[PDB]
Amino acid sequence: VQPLARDAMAYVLAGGRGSRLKELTDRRAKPAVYFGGKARIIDFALSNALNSGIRRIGVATAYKAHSLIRHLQRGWDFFRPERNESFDILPAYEGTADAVYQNIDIIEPYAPEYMVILAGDHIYKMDYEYMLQQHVDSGADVTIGCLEVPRMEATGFGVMHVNEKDEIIDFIEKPADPPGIPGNEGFALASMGIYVFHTKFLMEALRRDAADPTSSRDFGKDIIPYIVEHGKAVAHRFADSCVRSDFEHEPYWRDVGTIDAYWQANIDLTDVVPDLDIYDKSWPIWTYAEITPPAKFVHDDEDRRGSAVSSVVSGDCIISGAALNRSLLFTGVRANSYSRLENAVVLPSVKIGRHAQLSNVVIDHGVVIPEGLIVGEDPELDAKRFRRTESGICLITQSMIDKL
Amino acid sequence: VQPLARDAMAYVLAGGRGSRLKELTDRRAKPAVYFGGKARIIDFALSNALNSGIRRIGVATAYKAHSLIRHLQRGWDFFRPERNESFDILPWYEGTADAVYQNIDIIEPYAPEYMVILAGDHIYKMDYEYMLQQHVDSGADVTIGCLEVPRMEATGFGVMHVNEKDEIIDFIEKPADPPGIPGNEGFALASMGIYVFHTKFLMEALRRDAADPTSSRDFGKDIIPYIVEHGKAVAHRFADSCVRSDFEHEPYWRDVGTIDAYWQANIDLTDVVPDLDIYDKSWPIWTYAEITPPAKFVHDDEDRRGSAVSSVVSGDCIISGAALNRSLLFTGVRANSYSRLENAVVLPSVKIGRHAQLSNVVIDHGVVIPEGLIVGEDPELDAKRFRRTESGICLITQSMIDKL
């Protein structure tokens, strides 16, 4: 009868540094990185907890966390404890298990029956009620959310070796040749970093783990493999609980772990039929947002036409004689006369000077592009001035601009 | 030393039905009419009070007020009485003086030193501290906000006859030949419907007025002329207290009393340099707004190209193969392939069917435009199907569409 989410606390691991995103995460954590037009990455895991009916949320932070904490303070500010709601920001860790262990004194006063451990650095929509039900009905010590991926794609993941009842018999960190699913050997089960426990069980294990000087104090390296060995670990299929819009052709999950994958996932939202339906109202993503003026398009000559094509344009964007194609603009962008953006992911408050022409870029928050700058024409010059992927995507920060 | 706004209550008259706006105000009051992309008309008077430092606001409603009250409840909900703040929704009265008189029991517990009476159906920005200052320094029984307008334009206004100290010696309702300003007879002083009183003085002028069966129970017809004769009435120049952005070439103020004037004021926001700076942050306009997805533009062939030119587009707008020029779109608009909007004011949640072509229109909230519909091409056909101004602007509601 009663939803299991009533008795669950969501515990968000938001220490992720996202190193291979380089200067994008130099002064902010990966969960604080903007995505999709408005939100930040962490807002998806948070919104999944909210929409699943989980009213107690803890967020463990650490690295360059101030802008992540400022975001949480201002955007996730509507929980009231006297309605049995809590939003706890928990800065420091020794590992992902220690990030929970160190805050056991905040958890236990709430006495939640269940813990939902979440990675806060992925983009995905998921109804955690299904995982909670499966966890209690199975009897498991830990239920682990997993993606169905072709075996070749599973090589970058922690992979769960499963039997034909979906009980986890082995776990390999990044196998070059991942074990297949019994009876569907084309696909392997890749762990999402999503774990469901009985709270008292979990607390046994964080204490057991903290006493062990051999342990790296991580769920992935230490606690999960221990349970796979002497306990009972079961797998939950993302496809069973993923919240799919009518306009999403497959379950959506993205890591945006590299500058290419980050650029791709954002730019794919300019498609006619995007993989991610950012217009779904039935599973909405809450974030911090302000009342902003509308987007403005001005100038209509043969020399300059302020307009966007196959693009996503947020509010408070003034497109002044600038030509946009296959670009995603966050809030507050000013693009000026005769400038051109193509294949551009443009983070909030960026300013594009007159006559600048940029292609295949990610522009960091607040960057002021000088008048006349060109990017995307000269691979060697671009690679010297900016961070350039093998793909030809240039990440542009203010400190790179300042160095010219 | 201390600001006079600390001791003032702003009392907003929001009963205005706006008859000359016809079907636009059939199901909502004029203060509830959308303006500028996001806000409603009433939000300007409210924001002027807020930004002037006035912390107690009462809003008198009446005519078809369901959507106005819903807006006030959801958008103007952040006043907390224990911080000495109040926002009172006070719902069709005998007149604008009766709208205050009937709610003396709400005012007097607050015991504000001053009352700032505001018309809630105009678009303008004004720092009321200046008017309060002038009121106490002058000695007046009422200080009246006035526009400087050329005499020919002043005939549609209540007009104040002044002497050389700006003391009001007479008041004429809509004079066919308006009295000029001494030493500037090209211009007359037109009353804005903005009155400042000492609260104690105002309370019996309202009691005196309610006892008089000859009175229409209005500030303009009854209360002000009595004081102009028997008391002390002084005029305040809008130009002295108007809040002008650096990007506004003159004091603004708009009545949008007709469908043309409403269409013009909205469409003028598509200019390169608009008369109204909706991007000013020094005097912001608070309104009700929701977290919305960004605007999206799709399709790019010779048959259809989704893009906007010389246009203002709000969030949650999907512009799918539709061509927009000199248009203002509110939130939630869906424009579909091969459709065309020109000189269009498009209120929230409107849907434009494929192949439709509309020019010089105001589209009401939520209207679904059928595929292939053309407007602006055939003056005789348009005038039969819709409400058409002499200038050629057609107002389109759902019930007009339903009868085709």
Cα–Cα distance, B359 to B374 (Å, whole number): 8
Cβ–Cβ below 8 Å for B300 and A325: yes
CB B224 within 8 A of CB B209: no
Burial of B210 (0-12, 13-18, 19+ CB in 10 A): middle
The answer to whether residue B316 neighbours chain A at the CB level (below 8 Å) is yes
| Nearest Cα to Cα of residue A401 among A25, A27, A66, A23 | A23
Shortest distance between the Cα of B156 and any Cα of chain A, in A, equals: 32
3-class SS of residue A206 = helix
Secondary structure string (H, E, C) spanning B372-393: CCEECCCHHHHHHHCEECCCCC
Instruction: Specify the DSSP class assigned to residue A380.
Output: H
Q: Which two tokens stand for residue A36?
A: 């999709």
Cβ–Cβ below 8 Å for B294 and A300: no
The answer to whether residue A310 neighbours chain B at the CB level (below 8 Å) is yes
Which contiguous run of DSSP H or E holds residue A230?
helix A224-230
Shortest distance between the Cα of B402 and any Cα of chain A, in A, equals: 28
Cα–Cα distance, A304 to B120 (Å, whole number): 40
Chain A partners within 8 Å of B298 (Cβ): 270-272, 310
**Closest Cβ–Cβ partner in A291, A307, A310 for B309:** A307
What backbone phi and psi angles, to 5 degrees, belong to A276? -110, 125
Q: Which two tokens stand for residue B40?
A: 């409603």
Domain ranges for chain B, please list them: 1-279, 280-404
3-class SS of residue B138 = helix
Q: Resolution of this entry in Å? A: 2.2
Cβ–Cβ below 8 Å for B307 and A306: no
3-class SS of residue A218 = coil
Rg for chain A (alpha carbons), in Å?
A: 22
Contacts of B217 (CB under 8 A, 6+ apart): B93, B94, B95, B96, B97, B98, B101, B209, B210
Shortest distance between the Cα of A276 and any Cα of chain B, in A, equals: 12
Which contiguous run of DSSP H or E holds residue B99?
helix B96-101
Which A residues, 129 through 188, put their C-beta within 8 Å of a C-beta on chain B? none
At residue A178's C-alpha, the angle toward residues A172 and A182, to 5°, is: 105
Cα–Cα distance, B279 to B87 (Å, whole number): 26
Cα B61 to Cα A294, B204, B317, B365, distances in angstroms: 29, 22, 31, 21
CB B327 within 8 A of CB B346: yes
3-class SS of residue A83 = helix
CB A148 within 8 A of CB A189: yes
| Nearest Cα to Cα of residue B11 among B95, B71, B88 | B88
Cβ–Cβ below 8 Å for A300 and B309: yes
Per the listing, tokens 């009321």 go with: B128
Instruction: Choose from B313, B318, B343 for mutation: most chain A CBs within 10 A.
Output: B313
CA atoms within 13 A on the CB side of A278: 31
Contacts of B302 (CB under 8 A, 6+ apart): none
Question: In this structure, which amino acid lies at residue B312?
Answer: V
Residue of B nearest to A329 (CA): B294
Cβ–Cβ below 8 Å for B305 and A309: yes
Cα–Cα distance, A367 to A346 (Å, whole number): 9
CB A295 within 8 A of CB A333: no
Burial of B390 (0-12, 13-18, 19+ CB in 10 A): exposed
Q: Give the CA-trace dihedral at B294, B295, B298, B303, to 10 degrees.
A: 180
CB B74 within 8 A of CB B305: no
Instruction: Please list the residues that pair with A61 across neighbouring strands.
Output: A91
Cα–Cα distance, A118 to A151 (Å, whole number): 24
3-class SS of residue A167 = strand
| Nearest Cα to Cα of residue A315 among B294, B327, B278, B269 | B294
